[PDB]
Amino acid sequence: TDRPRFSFSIAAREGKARTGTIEMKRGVIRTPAFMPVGTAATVKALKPETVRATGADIILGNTYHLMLRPGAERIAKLGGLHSFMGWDRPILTDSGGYQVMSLSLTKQSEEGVTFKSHLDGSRHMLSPERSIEIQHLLGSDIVMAFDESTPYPATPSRAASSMERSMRWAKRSRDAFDSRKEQAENAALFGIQQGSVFENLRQQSADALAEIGFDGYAVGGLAVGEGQDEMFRVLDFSVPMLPDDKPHYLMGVGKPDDIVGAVERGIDMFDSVLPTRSGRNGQAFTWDGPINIRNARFSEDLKPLDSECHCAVCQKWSRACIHALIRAGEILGAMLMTEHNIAFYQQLMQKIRDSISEGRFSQFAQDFRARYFARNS
Amino acid sequence: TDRPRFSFSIAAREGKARTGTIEMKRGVIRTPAFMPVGTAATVKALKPETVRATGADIILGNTYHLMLRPGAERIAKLGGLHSFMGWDRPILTDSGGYQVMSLSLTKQSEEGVTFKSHLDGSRHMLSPERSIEIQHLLGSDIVMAFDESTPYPATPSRAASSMERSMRWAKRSRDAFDSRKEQAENAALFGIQQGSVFENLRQQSADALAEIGFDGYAVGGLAVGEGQDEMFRVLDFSVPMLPDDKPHYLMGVGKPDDIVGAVERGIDMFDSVLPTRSGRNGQAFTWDGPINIRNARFSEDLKPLDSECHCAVCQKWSRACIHALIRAGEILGAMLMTEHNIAFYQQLMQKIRDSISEGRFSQFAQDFRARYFARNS
Ligand SMILES: [Zn+2]
Ligand SMILES: [Zn+2]
């Protein structure tokens, strides 16, 4: 049977939480979804088949890093990110705009930005048009509109002007995407809501995005230093402003309890480097909270990282042996921790989906928090 | 202080057993000595610094395999085996003659042998003169005379003729070695006693070798299928025939109890692939006998491979975690087992040396056998 470009179906709801599917030409994405951050398929990283076996339906590509090395045109000549990452299922790319704020910047205006590569100092340009074109060259299935991030905390004036520029750039992203037939017929485009902590600015942003029209809507400007309390407060009024029948995407979030609370507030999609960064640093996520595998307590602990996790690592490896690998600096140790962490995240999402489907998600969320924060690991 | 070409000193004796040192220009060899079989310094093998840290004072090079790949001239152009194996301490090379019997053979005569490479079918030639020259090109510190092996079991006639040819070839090895000033002044040459299980042939051989004169004397024709009982019986009368004040070398032996009994019979030097072959196959040597680390009993065994071994593996790794590595096919598992096995062999030799020095070696040998064969692992 033929597969659609982008079809979001909601199968069940509990309060603001939703569970369902996004059907795309390269596969189905179960929601709520967690997207691990992808990298080149080399001996340095988990194999793509390993990432898929953790349960991931889609992975994320960082446009900014790919355009500095090896470059978007080079990626295209190699067959796009799907070949480059050895991943034939959907790929979401960010716009590159956040990293130019956080990692580089030679010129800024309504036109776009010019920035210096922190690698070789070379100059690069991004704009709604260039960002959408680069994401096309990467073979992206879900394209993010290019917006303006204002650093945290933002004044009411800075938040107002960045949101308004972002909305003008959202229309430009829309038109650039629509102008490219191969991209418009085969990929999807998400808009990004801005407005910082100000409800009227968030509503303005949401109204603008809905008038332009997108396949999905992200909540931007959070997870940038504000803390969970205020992030939840902003989600409380911001997510209901977005179109109900399209996916809602909270970018760069986050810790497991962040994810649970955001789903309670209507978020459908997530990404975070946390599982990978933690895995390389010897920290494992468990249902009893995170653990530091280097701790002496684990040196003779024959139980797996998490006794309820069904990832391939926990079927086989004890805390004691992962402890030994990590303490010796063996790369296998980091690989096992990273595989478990990504798989744990997918099992979290699966438990979220199942509990919403059964109408017991609010109880799952309470059960989850009580145990995650008690830390009886 | 300047170092001698070859100086064997006996420090202490108990019965036929001796302990002491061989001083050579590239270092001191403690005796009785075990020589692991060396290979090229690549990611496939233990690093040379690891092999040294196990206690090895000297390693063995298989001339036959090195002459098929990459070839003796190629080894020389790379700086000899010391550069090729990353090992700056003494290296003993065999003559290549045993492997032409056991692994290849297009022509055989009193002149030498011509054989077909089991790799690429190419033709090669060995002779006392060519073998000594190749071992020179390899940078060998201890050179083995080229002899004729007769397969086991040998008729009294075949044993007689092979021994006599070997003695004529021993003189030719001696003269070839002596003809090359750079080799004669910096390396040593061992002769090889033959005669199978026949006492008069062994005496004939020993007399011939002593008349030629060598720096050391090997007992050949054992560990080829005969079993330990008969090997010990042959050693009982064969080793006393050799010059007392030169090292005695039992080639290709062997299991730990073989080594102990051979030292009781006057052997000073040993080599065997057993520690490495076992390590790759998941078998570890211990004071309670060998263990198969794949056995289910080890999956939760937090004790090291051997609780009295002081190798770097046993300081750190449990049976349970080596078990997990081996069962997963992780190369680290084989590396750890091989390091422990070679280190265990060196600790065996150290206990042999110390017990002889203290005049308690015969008691050590009895204690060792009772525990090794009870197998309370
Ligand atoms: Zn797991
Ligand atoms: Zn050990």
Curated annotation (Swiss-Prot), chains A, B:
Pathway participation: tRNA modification; tRNA-queuosine biosynthesis
Q: Membrane-crossing residues?
A: none
Region of interest called RNA binding, as start-end residue ranges on this chain: 252-258, 276-280
Q: State the reactions this protein catalyses.
A: 7-aminomethyl-7-carbaguanine + guanosine(34) in tRNA = 7-aminomethyl-7-carbaguanosine(34) in tRNA + guanine
Q: Which UniProt keywords apply?
A: Glycosyltransferase, Metal-binding, Queuosine biosynthesis, Transferase, tRNA processing, Zinc
Binding positions for Zn(2+)? C309, C311, C314, H340
Q: Which residues bind substrate?
A: D94, S95, G96, G97, Y98, D147, Q194, G221
Q: Name one GO molecular function term.
A: tRNA-guanosine(34) queuine transglycosylase activity
> In its UniProt record, which GO terms are filed under biological process?
queuosine biosynthetic process; tRNA wobble guanine modification; tRNA-guanine transglycosylation
What are the annotated GO cellular component locations? Answer: cytosol
The enzyme's E.C. designation: 2.4.2.29
Task: Extract the Pfam families matched here.
Answer: TGT
Q: Which residues form a coiled coil?
A: none
- Carries keyword Glycosyltransferase? yes
**Gene3D superfamilies, per the entry:** Queuine tRNA-ribosyltransferase-like
Note how many cofactor molecules are bound and how. Binds 1 zinc ion per subunit.
What cofactor does this chain's UniProt record say it requires? Zn(2+)
- Spell out the catalytic residues: D94 (proton acceptor), D271 (nucleophile)
UniProt subunit comment:
Homodimer. Within each dimer, one monomer is responsible for RNA recognition and catalysis, while the other monomer binds to the replacement base PreQ1.
Role, per record: Catalyzes the base-exchange of a guanine (G) residue with the queuine precursor 7-aminomethyl-7-deazaguanine (PreQ1) at position 34 (anticodon wobble position) in tRNAs with GU(N) anticodons (tRNA-Asp, -Asn, -His and -Tyr). Catalysis occurs through a double-displacement mechanism. The nucleophile active site attacks the C1' of nucleotide 34 to detach the guanine base from the RNA, forming a covalent enzyme-RNA intermediate. The proton acceptor active site deprotonates the incoming PreQ1, allowing a nucleophilic attack on the C1' of the ribose to form the product.
Query: Could you say which protein family the record assigns here?
Result: Belongs to the queuine tRNA-ribosyltransferase family.
Entries under HAMAP family matching the protein: Q_tRNA_Tgt (MF_00168)
PANTHER family named among the record's database cross-references: QUEUINE TRNA-RIBOSYLTRANSFERASE (PTHR46499:SF1)
Record's protein name: Queuine tRNA-ribosyltransferase
Species per Swiss-Prot/TrEMBL record: Zymomonas mobilis subsp. mobilis (strain ATCC 31821 / ZM4 / CP4)
Q: Write the gene name.
A: tgt
